[PDB]
Symmetry: C3
Subunit: 113 residues, 3 copies
């Protein structure tokens, strides 16, 4: 069944200023980069919210290790590395990204066995 769900909104211009946690692949895909980086930030945050959300009342247990990979058609897929890849070993992650005007968003759903 479902482990958790997360959603995130990111202000693109504010994110652009803040960045001045991403893989080479992400940075490559992004480079108008702010839009793309902001939606990848939202996606990492959605994944975190979905997982951490499943650990209600537990002590918390990262951003670079949640990688949005894109295929040749630009479809997003999450690839995990590091300590979170261990924790979410049997978990399937579904994500979707959007950016419209000044706002990026993402949703993630984690699903296990």
């Amino acid at each position: 069944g479902i482990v958790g769900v997360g959603i995130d909104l990111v202000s693109i211009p504010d994110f652009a200023e803040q960045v001045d946690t991403f893989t080479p692949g992400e940075r490559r895909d992004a480079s108008s980069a702010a839009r793309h980086l902001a939606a990848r930030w939202a996606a990492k945050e959605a994944v975190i919210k979905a997982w951490s959300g499943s650990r209600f009342a537990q002590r918390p247990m990262i951003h670079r290790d949640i990688e949005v990979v894109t295929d040749m058609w630009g479809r997003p897929r999450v690839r995990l590395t590091g300590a979170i890849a261990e924790y979410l070993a049997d978990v399937t992650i579904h994500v979707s990204l959007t950016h419209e005007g000044d706002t990026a968003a993402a949703v993630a759903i984690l699903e296990a066995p």
Copy 2:
């Protein structure tokens, strides 16, 4: 499988003016309160949309009874009371909240047996 999904956007400043349906726990968690109350409003609305959405072509069958509980780390979890707690007795609710600038949002997924 999945019962339904809901999403909701809430304008924070407009919500702030409108409020001038929340539990003591919610009101406590919220108190900058408008942001927090708006995302809790979005979460209640997402839950309603997910459930009611599963009743296509049926006569409709509440906000205080959909409580966003937070743990010591601020993770959200829905607790139901009242008549909706009866209707959704076997249903697991997954939620996620966000607020960025003037906009709050929430997503809910209901899952049954």
Copy 3:
């Protein structure tokens, strides 16, 4: 389990200008129409993202054929026709729509056997 998830944001005023892919039922339901058409556009896009998202690294395989039907209470439900109805034959689609101020959004989750 889950096939995919999609999310979409649509600027309502920009969408209104762009439209100047919808069924008679959708156009009827919509007619302040821009708001309603924008959320239906977001819903079609979310469905596409959820399905196409499940085809990572595959060659892509439409908008009129993803119909948001509403019941007498305005609950949304997707009805498929055409080539996508074939491709998604065994797939259950869950959707939710929202529009607040200048922004519409939608989320879709596809679920199979």
